[PDB]
Design a protein around this ligand. Sequence first.
Ligand code: LAJ
Ligand code: LAJ
Lengths: 260, 259
Amino acid sequence: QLSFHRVDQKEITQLSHLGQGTRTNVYEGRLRELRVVLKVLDPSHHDIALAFYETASLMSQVSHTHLAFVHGVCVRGPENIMVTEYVEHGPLDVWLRRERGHVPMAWKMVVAQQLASALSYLENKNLVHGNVCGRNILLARLGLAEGTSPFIKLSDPGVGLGALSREERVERIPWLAPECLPGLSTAMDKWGFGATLLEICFDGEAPLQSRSPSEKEHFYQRQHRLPEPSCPQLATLTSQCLTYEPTQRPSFRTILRDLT
Amino acid sequence: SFHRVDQKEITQLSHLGQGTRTNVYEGRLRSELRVVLKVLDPSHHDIALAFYETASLMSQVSHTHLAFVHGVCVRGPENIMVTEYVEHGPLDVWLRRERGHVPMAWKMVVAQQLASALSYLENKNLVHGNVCGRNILLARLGLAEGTSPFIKLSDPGVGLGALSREERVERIPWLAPECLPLSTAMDKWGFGATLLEICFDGEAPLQSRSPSEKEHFYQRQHRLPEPSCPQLATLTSQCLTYEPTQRPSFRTILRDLTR
Ligand SMILES: CNC(=O)c1nnc(Nc2ccccn2)cc1Nc1ccccc1S(C)(=O)=O
Ligand SMILES: CNC(=O)c1nnc(Nc2ccccn2)cc1Nc1ccccc1S(C)(=O)=O
């Protein structure tokens, strides 16, 4: 059977809208009464729902201190709701943009180590995330007080990369690995981790973000490389990760070693 | 007494809440540190003096369970006390959102830590005057499995001696009854009332009840409820007596909390 827990509609209450994901609306919710996040999938075709079920399946089969927990899935007729863990401070990118110019390098290094740690665990299990970006990095603890460190939870990838259109894949540039643009290896999470490091270094302002779909696509087609981070401590690491040859990208074991 | 902070050194951020005659904000202090800014309302010199005395007192103390005071900024008609920022904030708020899921072992650690901070002030013959869950801050939550709490007792804000009868009545049940019409005996009553609030998951007795009712309760010398937790029942009965001399020392309270 299904490799995820089934949630009955009588067990869940839907509350405040928090934002939007790829083909989803995210709400705060209560699970019979635990505070949760409800990822409501748009009215979708069976191939989209199936890519969503695969994400829930994958997440239910994993357990790591830096990966957000999935409670299960609710199928209320034409609607698919993924019931997941609620993370106190929400998306990292939003927070980096609120605190721009006041985020110390030491703090960013802790986030990077924690993210590499979560991705190393998936690598060893030969599991592909497919959507590593600052928006899917959630802050459990901000680490603002003296002698406190940030604590992140990497969210589920949402609707699997394989189910998305070219337009959606182009929207995921620079986080999307270039081998994914035509359209699944763990080598893609190494590019995604690299692009996330740049976004963190540049305080939630990723390269090419303002740039149009045509421009983003043009950049990948012509094999242009992304800027070097302002931070020189992560410059080598991002140059290695952000290569167009997936085999050339280092393992997370090496990345973790290089970070610590 | 206390360090003077120039307005060019601080940055005022989000509003966190309110204290007696103050507005509390998140902030940044250059040499960058995350801080809390306690902005005093436009006030008279006797109110500002009671606020300077608090800053003075809190600059002269050093304990792992007392929040640090960086100094004071004087911006136009506003007196800004620059203090330590604590990660999780007020205990009472946290107890209310986690009601029915706070273990007795956790509450016992908080009680020991609070008695420890108050024992230090008693030995130095220093009065806090505002012991309540709102003034108890969590550096470490301890709510998660395998985490233990770590509290910081905040500064008392505007000293009790500067407040009106109206404000004193609003402080019931934390306010010692001899204060309704300054000794370290008042902090024993305050510690007792805080233990009830902790036991009742941030729901203090008489909280909702009107000023007239609160005042009536003290005037008629009625005693506060026994805590649901039997382990702290004796301790709260001893602390919450109308005779200040009858209240035990923090040395005794601390000793009793180990057993
Ligand atoms: C697995 N858990 C989550 O995904 C999740 N958990 N807690 C959150 N807390 C939270 C606190 C304050 C404000 C907003 N959020 C946000 C979350 N998702 C979220 C929220 C808004 C926009 C997009 C997404 S997402 C990652 O793309 O699903
Ligand atoms: C000495 N330091 C403090 O007093 C203080 N330090 N850190 C805080 N963190 C904090 C984190 C999250 C949410 C709210 N707060 C709150 C604080 N005060 C506070 C905040 C809101 C309401 C009343 C007061 S108070 C005790 O009456 O000053």
